[PDB]
Symmetry: C4
Subunit: 462 residues, 4 copies
């Protein structure tokens, strides 16, 4: 019909699928602690190891749909794998297979979707696509905001009303229909994109091609599955990649004429220094949100509402929507890069800094609201790196696999919070929580220096 | 005679008529509490419901004088209705008809004046009329400053000197001669504008036209009158408008080709989010100025003067005159819009924040002087909206009637201060005043996000 | 010889004559309190009334030397009247004629000099004379700095060594040779300016002209003298000027076509609002520096040096030399004017604000160092007014005589510090000093509004 | 081979030789206090007097290598004199000849190197050599950072493990192989610079020239040696220079047509005002780091690592690498010069300011980390002076010799910390340390005024 009339049907199906994902990534780390009876140091590792599967997952979906099936059926097929992916999550037992089962089932379902969203959006224009994409990114951001503000309040509503543990699984179902919502938001308008097809679905489909794809999906389903039964295999797949991915450049650091490669490695070794700090909010900060912070969010002197145990992790698409034409105040190179590490640094100092004050037995209620603004403030302006530094065929995935490796090592950082499950009084939990955030932040200042230390070398080579 | 010699005779008659209005809007809310014996929750509603009549009132006067009588006689006729409008106010009884009588009598007297002031000023130029209007607006602002700084000090001077309640009515008479002043400021110079007539008073007047106008005025006088005898009718006129005014766009949100209409609704639904916060200074803050704040305005350690109970509401044309070429510091789109909500937000936090400290029995004397600067700081730069976004015949008044509806809902916000009239000790009043301003301000931060959440959508459509 | 070689001989003779003047204006107010046995309220008035003679005094010298004798002999004759002007000051008795005698003897000696300095400097160029004058002004400022930092330390050195009161007169002699220094700094180089003569001393001198000039000087000497014997005559000369100088514009406010005159009066009535606040540092602050401030200038915790009782008034050519290419940070109308009043305002609040804290019996040692920076910060950028707004013959002196009238009214402001001379314990002096500086500063904020209140009227008329 | 391929072999040999030097200038002042049994006031003077030899030392090496031997062999010969220069330092006795011996042996070894580094770098370009040099300067700065962070931790590792004093000499050997490292970093690549020779080593070498050079070196070795045996000779060589170097301009202040010379002296007398404040970090602050500061670097509440007694002096190439494209924020004359003195001033106030608080017996652990940032903040932007103000043959070294004289007078400033070696309890050391840093800083503000006091004179003469 029209350009902008075409634009919603990929915006809105993203707006609902993205709404599905964050309901998982909200409580599932905080889930497997007090209900099941996991220790916690086992439990930190799981989503830790899970996340590395997920950032590398746009590569596979970057391979499949643009080359085999066509984008649109891959945009179709990437949908309702999450339909199993939470209906399997919500069957109310406690047998610990289903839990670790469907987590990897998400991955190809995530994978066949995320570089299949914007890739067609990149071809309804043919370049001020930011004027198209900043609809979409702030369509993600309006969409992702609706998510975790809601998706544990359902979990709050149940488990002192219906009687037993029939509620943790219930809130999982909220995103389950939410992806089924995103079906019908497409299904009732799936004629709009008909003039903007990819390149295989110009021609009709191939079941000779399709059966292998779902088989290699079903290969990858079980491949992503067999991890969390005895976590040592997660190490062994990294130490074959994590040696050979530094070896990816060993073919062309000093052997290969144009040393922008190692300067792209200079960005790359800097890039891994990001994501190691991120995963703490999905890990230890969630444990920090369990047995220290009071849930009596009192402004000044009055009384307000008790928080969730974990809608803290919903604050993150507030600030990347607030501080996001603010950080588009242009007039009023990758080192804007750097000083954001110091934001992450001064982020971390705060968390002992209130526990410095208000020992009450417990911590101090507030704290977090300026915490999450810090990490977001560097998070906005630093993507596009080797995707900014635009002979390719290895240069493509070289940034990707290490990025997932960078995603992995947050768990092996965060392990020091392992209070034994016998220590009950949180007068003695805080002194082991204070000994981790500061010395994480001490070296977090030291990170700032290292980009600056080689900083004037870049201005010449460009 | 001359252009600038013509310019005073509309400036000065505005400068005196505007001087009349604020004497009413100063104490009349604080009037009907401790003298009559109203509760207070009845009393908040009255000026609350009165104000909605007044912002819609330039529309009717925008219809009458430019089309029927001519501007000048409408500029004449809009004057001395206030002459009854305060001489009726000042007759010293306590029978509660006169009070609610003349309040609506103001309205057409206000109505036939405010878009008849500047409309001729718009035609002594034929466009840097801001270089004409910023005389006028700061002629309003020099004029409006003289007002409420004075108009309750008269009320102070009486009621412990002359003996009884013969003083509340006395200060009302100060503006009564003040409008009679504005007669003679015109009447001794009413030959100057003779070359700048409208379009009916090019021709001679029509009593065949005039008698209906004053009849429809006298219709509207009683129509505006019959409200405050049993306040439920004020609801019922809103719920016929407030449904049909959202229905005004229902003819042309999704039916009507050019979606700037709903983006003008995006400004509009944002616009209503303003005025709901305004009316608190004309309502609850005045009650907050009665039985908490000490009147011992002590700078640092010395002694100064006891305040009025309500010249606080005079501070508002100070700051919109101070901060008003400051906010014309240009080089050193409607989202400048937005962050002013955060000013209104951080405005409100202060009021418990001093009561947080100086519990003395009572509150803490100071407080307010930085309070009123906040609301003004957003108030300067946000008008001109659909009057900035310039097929019209419904688009005109659609912003207006909802704006008065937006004016209305402040009273149904502010009702929570209803202390029963038996509770005397203000040690127990403050804990019910602290429970309202914070959670008004809590969501006042939440307002800031919502313009930002859809903010990048505007830059494309223009 | 050369341009710049000519430039010193008027720079340096200014640099020494200006060095002479400030030695007087340093302690002479603080002189006539504890030695003689004056009360203090008599003593405040004297330099108060003296100062008004002095700012009007460039007008008379603006008349004499450029028209009668020639600049150079008037530059000569304006010198060593101060030679009597301090040798008369230093004769060691206590008879109170000499004191009030030579104060007015300064005036014509000041008068025949200050507009005779730069007027020739204006004609060694024939216009980037600021590149000439900012040598000179910062030659004044390097010169004036050497002054009062030294000229009471001599007074410190004597009066507990030589035995009696033979020292107050001694420090007066320091500037006495200092003007005799400025003789020889000219006298050993008085051939340099020989090619840059005025216009009478092109021709030879006239004793027929000269004898009247010194007679009218000797008329003006006794005329300036007969003031301080019974101070009521000082009123009566103002109330003939101060009525007729407002009457100077009464010929041409509303009678005289071009209303920049009253806008120049708008600057003028604003201009008088300056100087009323200035004279406090030459008056009450000096009394505030007598019997409150401890002289134990302790940085942090150690020990430093005891101050003078009055080198505080030497701080003022420090800051107008520090903050003076700072305030020439241009890119990184007279309302820059205005906000400097708020600097003067926030200046004054400090003085009770430390006495708020450190009641020790006495005040708090520090205080002043940020005080004097405030008054200077507005003092730099506000001269040149009607001398900026460039049919003249009355427009010239109209700003001048009111400026001296503005100089006068500081004394009738500062009178409220009149502690009776019997009250010894400074525990009870501070509560009458706190009651004056705040309410001076309360209205000092109110001054800021008044320029802003008419501020947009100026941008049109220019 | 290539330009940038040539660029390392002078970068890296600088990067290792500079790495050698700072290992000495780190602990050698703190060395001769508690081990040997020196008082301290003798010990301050030694490196104090040593430093003056070192800044003048680029002049001699600016004479030798570019004119006699050729740069490259002078770049060769300037290396391994430090090889003796620390192997002599490390022979484990306590006879106090070796200590004062090899300190001057450094000097010609430093001298034949520092203007022989960049001088060839100035001729691999032939002018955006800053785009070459900011590699090098931040190659110095990446190199110099590796230094003192490490070179007393070796000294920590020994002297409570191996038993006795066999460790102070051990850490000296760390730089000894480090210069031997810088041999092989050249020696394994000494064919790269072969096309970029100086001008003597175009031709073959001369042993008829060489033997005098090493003899005049061996003259200068003993000449620099005979100082510290009885320190009065160090005075007598200054008072022959320090009179005649002010006499260097006495030939051409007022005798010599172009007064930029004295304005270059205006920079010069300002320039000496720098370096007097510097040497305190190499002197008294090191003593301040001995017997006041606790070594329990506790962030907030936890526990971290005990410091060194002197890696504080390693902080200085952190900040001049952090704050060094920050201070290259250009758009967002020598008076940028000036306000950095106020940074040095507000630097010094801090050191009593924490001892003001946390008297514990001892001082307060933290303190220093914001201290060293201050001195660096002026240190970046102020070099290049008479090397910026570009008839030479005396104008060259005139800035140099006074700069070393300026280097000298820090020791005669810092002498006031001479606690007698008997006073043990550091409750009584701090009150003599507080009495020095403040009144050093009191006049440090006074320095700021003096450039400003003559500041507008410069803008005309250029």
């Amino acid at each position: 019909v029209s350009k902008t009339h075409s634009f919603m049907t990929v915006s809105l199906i993203e707006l609902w699928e993205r709404f599905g994902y964050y309901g998982m990534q909200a409580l599932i780390v905080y889930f497997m602690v007090q209900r099941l009876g996991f220790d916690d140091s086992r439990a930190n590792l799981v989503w830790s190891a899970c996340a590395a599967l997920i950032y590398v997952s746009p590569a596979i979906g970057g391979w499949v749909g643009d080359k085999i099936l066509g984008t649109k059926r891959t945009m179709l097929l990437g949908a309702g794998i999450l339909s199993v992916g939470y209906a399997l999550m919500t069957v109310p037992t406690e047998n610990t297979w289903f839990m670790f089962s469907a987590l990897g089932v998400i991955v190809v379902g995530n994978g066949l979707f995320k570089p299949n969203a914007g890739n067609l959006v990149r071809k309804i224009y043919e370049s001020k696509i930011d004027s198209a994409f900043t609809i979409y990114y702030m369509a993600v951001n309006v969409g992702s905001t609706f998510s975790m503000l809601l998706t544990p309040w359902i979990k709050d509503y149940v488990n002192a009303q219906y009687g037993n543990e029939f509620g943790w699984h219930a809130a999982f179902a909220v995103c389950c229909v939410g992806i089924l919502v995103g079906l019908g938001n497409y299904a009732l308008m799936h004629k709009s994109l008909a003039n903007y097809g990819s390149e295989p679905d110009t021609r009709p489909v191939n079941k000779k091609s399709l059966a292998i794809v779902l088989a290699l999906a079903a290969l990858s389903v079980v491949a992503s599955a067999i991890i969390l039964e005895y976590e040592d295999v997660a190490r062994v797949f990294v130490y074959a990649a994590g040696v050979a991915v530094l070896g990816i450049f060993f073919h062309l650091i000093r052997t290969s004429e144009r040393a922008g490669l190692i300067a792209a490695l200079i960005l790359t070794v800097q890039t891994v220094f990001f994501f190691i700090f991120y995963q703490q909010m999905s890990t230890s900060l969630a444990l920090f949100a369990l047995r220290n912070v009071d849930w009596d969010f009192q402004v000044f002197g009055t009384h307000l509402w008790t928080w969730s145990p974990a809608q803290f992790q919903a604050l993150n698409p507030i600030w990347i929507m607030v501080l996001s034409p603010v950080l588009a105040w242009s007039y009023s190179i990758a080192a804007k890069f750097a000083l954001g590490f110091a934001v992450v640094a001064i982020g971390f100092f705060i968390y002992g800094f209130a526990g410095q004050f208000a020992v009450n037995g417990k911590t101090s209620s507030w704290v977090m609201i300026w915490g999450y603004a810090s990490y977001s403030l560097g998070e906005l302006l630093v993507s596009g790196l080797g995707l900014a530094m635009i002979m390719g065929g290895f240069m493509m995935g070289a940034y990707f696999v290490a990025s997932g490796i960078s995603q992995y090592l947050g768990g092996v950082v965060a392990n020091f919070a392992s209070v034994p499950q016998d220590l009950v009084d949180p007068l003695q939990t805080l002194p082991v929580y204070t000994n981790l955030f500061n010395k994480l932040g001490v070296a977090a200042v030291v990170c700032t220096i290292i980009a600056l230390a080689v900083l004037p070398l870049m201005r010449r080579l460009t």
